[PDB]
Amino acid sequence: DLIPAPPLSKVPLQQNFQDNQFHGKWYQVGRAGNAAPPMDPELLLLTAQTYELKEDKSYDVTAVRFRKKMCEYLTMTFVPSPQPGEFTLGNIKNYPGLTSYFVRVVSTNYNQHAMVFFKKVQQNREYFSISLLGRTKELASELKENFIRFSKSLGLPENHIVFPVPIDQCID
Ligand SMILES: [Y+3]
């Protein structure tokens, strides 16, 4: 049932990560991961996220999506770990069935695009995912192709990579 998570050696880490340049609003322009494609195609609408850099240097990351006529929000806290650009999950004891959570920012120019890699253990199944983030709702096709390449290098097939359609509700 799941494509194996890749060894973390296959996942680059953005060098000299600057938390205060990575903050603020991003659109999840590309998604890839071993989780199954959604059965509800309404989840294929573009979401937005805010990486709110807090006083204690953790981020309170809030994602919004449009679903069933409403804006649905979810906030999680990313606690910086010893390597700049890597994070674990704040107060994981508050998340039922979620036992492990890891974030690595793979690459970014801060002002246009980012790729962020996630690996978590939920119900003792190991999931991984990669997000392509844009400061605008659309990105250059060469960036989308690079994201596909990268996703396939971690063992993902084309049907586990998707490019959500920009919407105006909730996210702008
Ligand atoms: Y997500």
Q: Output the CATH homologous superfamily.
A: Calycin beta-barrel core domain
Distance between the termini: 36 Å
Q: Which CATH class is shown?
A: Mainly Beta
- The secondary-structure class comes to mainly beta
Query: How are the strands of the biggest sheet laid out side by side?
Result: 1-2-3-4-5-6-7-8
H/E element order: HEEEEEEEEHE
Tally of DSSP β-strands: 9
Bound molecules: yttrium (III) ion
Q: Percentage of helical residues?
A: under 10%
Q: How many helix segments?
A: 2
Q: What summary fits the major beta sheet? A: 8 strands, antiparallel, barrel
Radius of gyration: 15 Å
In CATH terms, what is the architecture?
Answer: Beta Barrel
CATH topology: Lipocalin
Keywords: Apoptosis, Cytoplasmic vesicle, Disulfide bond, Glycoprotein, Immunity, Innate immunity, Ion transport, Iron, Iron transport, Pyrrolidone carboxylic acid, Secreted, Signal, Transport
Subcellular location: Secreted; Cytoplasmic granule lumen; Cytoplasmic vesicle lumen
Glycosylation sites: 60
Pfam family, one: Lipocalin
